[PDB]
Amino acid sequence: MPAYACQRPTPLTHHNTGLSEALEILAEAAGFEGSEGRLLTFCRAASVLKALPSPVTTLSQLQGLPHFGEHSSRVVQELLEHGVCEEVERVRRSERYQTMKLFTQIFGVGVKTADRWYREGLRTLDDLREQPQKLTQQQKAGLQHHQDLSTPVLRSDVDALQQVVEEAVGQALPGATVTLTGGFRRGKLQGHDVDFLITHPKEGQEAGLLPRVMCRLQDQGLILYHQFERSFCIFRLPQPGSWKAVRVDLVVAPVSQFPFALLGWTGSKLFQRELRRFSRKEKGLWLNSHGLFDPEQKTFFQAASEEDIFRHLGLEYLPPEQRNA
DNA sequence: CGGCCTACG
DNA sequence: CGTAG
DNA sequence: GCCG
Ligand SMILES: [Mn+2]
Ligand SMILES: [Mn+2]
Ligand SMILES: [Mn+2]
Ligand SMILES: [Mn+2]
Ligand SMILES: [Mn+2]
Ligand SMILES: [Mn+2]
Ligand code: NA
Numbered sequence: 001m002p003a004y005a006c007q008r009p010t011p012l013t014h015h016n017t018g019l020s021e022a023l024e025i026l027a028e029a030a031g032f033e034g035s036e037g038r039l040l041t042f043c044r045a046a047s048v049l050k051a052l053p054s055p056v057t058t059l060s061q062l063q064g065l066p067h068f069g070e071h072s073s074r075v076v077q078e079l080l081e082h083g084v085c086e087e088v089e090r091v092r093r094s095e096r097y098q099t100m101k102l103f104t105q106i107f108g109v110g111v112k113t114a115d116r117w118y119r120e121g122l123r124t125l126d127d128l129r130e131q132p133q134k135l136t137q138q139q140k141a142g143l144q145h146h147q148d149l150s151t152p153v154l155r156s157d158v159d160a161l162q163q164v165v166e167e168a169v170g171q172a173l174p175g176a177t178v179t180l181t182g183g184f185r186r187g188k189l190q191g192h193d194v195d196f197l198i199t200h201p202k203e204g205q206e207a208g209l210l211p212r213v214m215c216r217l218q219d220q221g222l223i224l225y226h227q228f229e230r231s232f233c234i235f236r237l238p239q240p241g242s243w244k245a246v247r248v249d250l251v252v253a254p255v256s257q258f259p260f261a262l263l264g265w266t267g268s269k270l271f272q273r274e275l276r277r278f279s280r281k282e283k284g285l286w287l288n289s290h291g292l293f294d295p296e297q298k299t300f301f302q303a304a305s306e307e308d309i310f311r312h313l314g315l316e317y318l319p320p321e322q323r324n325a
Numbered sequence: 326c327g328g329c330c331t332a333c334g
Numbered sequence: 335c336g337t338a339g
Numbered sequence: 340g341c342c343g
Pocket of ligand 7: 109
């Protein structure tokens with residue numbers, strides 16, 4: 001089992017769901033306490049289990065697996081023996097964990113803001129609504145729309161949103177294209193948001209495109225919130241006899257950068273962190289959603305496809321549905 | 326032990 | 335500070 | 340928390 005998540009297929013559904021979920025609780029808790037290192041180890045350990053071909057049934061089977069040390073092994077051992085891990089359950093029921101989860105899941109609120117509010121004694125969403133002068137416009141939007149934004153986005157929703165984005169993009173720039181990215185490109189049937197990547201086959205014609213797209217969506221009454229290359233929107237999505245708010249991310253890239261942007265925006269988040277770490281540490285190349293840089297020759301790698309990028313990193317190709325690290 | 330991805334709004 | 339995968 |  002290779003050490004980096006980008007070196008192994010990780011399907012969306014797998015054989016160790018309960019074990020991975022418990023490790024991901026500890027990862028999330030570590031993030032709420034500012035320990036990105038412990039978050040990463042717990043996330044990586046969970047991801048290893050997702051990549052296994054069958055269920056872990058005995059502690060012996062963790063021997064030699066990367067990212068399983070004393071702590072993560074004990075979590076698995078307790079779940080195997082008792083069906084529950086006291087540490088995990090203590091985290092789950094803790095006021096700190098529940099409140100940090102509630103606050104950080106608000107659009108506009110990160111760990112730093114949630115932590116400050118927690119120390120000020122705030123605990124509920126209505127606590128935040130009582131003092132709205134303290135909130136950013138982004139946070140006010142996240143709070144007004146919080147209920148809808150907590151409701152799963154379905155594939156049928158995604159198809160409807162893609163049609164309206166394509167209509168605005170078509171008027172903004174004939175020939176421009178719209179590609180579904182994020183979790184839905186990896187095969188998820190539901191999600192909490194929708195991600196799109198926009199380009200044009202003629203290099204440079206995409207310049208200035210996102211304002212024109214946003215102006216046209218706004219004029220159609222579809223934008224409940226927006227604040228360029230990346231637009232983090234709340235869309236009004238028609239529903240039977242009503243509508244609901246949906247988070248949509250719109251991203252523009254020139255066609256030269258499109259394979260890097262597609263790779264980056266298809267994720268998963270952990271997969272891309274691991275891929276960038278592998279690139280730099282194992283191959284000495286610097287990767288982001290714009291390109292891949294050789295800092296010795298001081299040159300950028302030209303890519304026409306995601307397959308190109310995997311080849312330039314010496315990695316076997318993984319389709320999106322196997323990037324669910 | 327140091328590192329832990331790397332951007333944009 | 336927030337956002338993104 | 341774990342790896343190199
Ligand atoms: Mn420990
Ligand atoms: Mn026991
Ligand atoms: Mn997404
Ligand atoms: Mn998104
Ligand atoms: Mn750019
Ligand atoms: Mn150290
Ligand atoms: Na948030």
